[PDB]
Amino acid sequence: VLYENQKLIANQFNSAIGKIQDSLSSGKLQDVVNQNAQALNTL
Amino acid sequence: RNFYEPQIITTDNTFVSGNCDVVIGIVNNTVYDPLQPELD
Structure with missing residues (x-):
């Protein structure tokens, strides 16, 4: 099933990485930074 | 795959599907x- 379908699975993987780039380009890391900063500022 | 132990290729440890012109890397x-x- 892999071996007769190599080029397709290929193409889908490349297209999937393709859209992953745009999806990232277009919060859970931001929030820890924001919380630390707000606590320092109140201090 | 985890321990090197060679065996003769027979129809008892392989299977068949398709014609050998679509896979890339089909050693004749x-x-x-057996x-x-x-029998003969």
Whole structure:
């Protein structure tokens, strides 16, 4: 099933990485930074 | 795959599906049928 379908699975993987780039380009890391900063500022 | 232990390629440790013109890397190697000699 892999071996007769190599080029397709290929193409889908490349297209999937393709859209992953745009999806990232277009919060859970931001929030820890924001919380630390707000606590320092109140201090 | 985890321990090197070679065996002759027979129709008892492989299976078949399709014609060898769609896979890329199909070494034309002789596969051994056990019944064909032993019966004859």
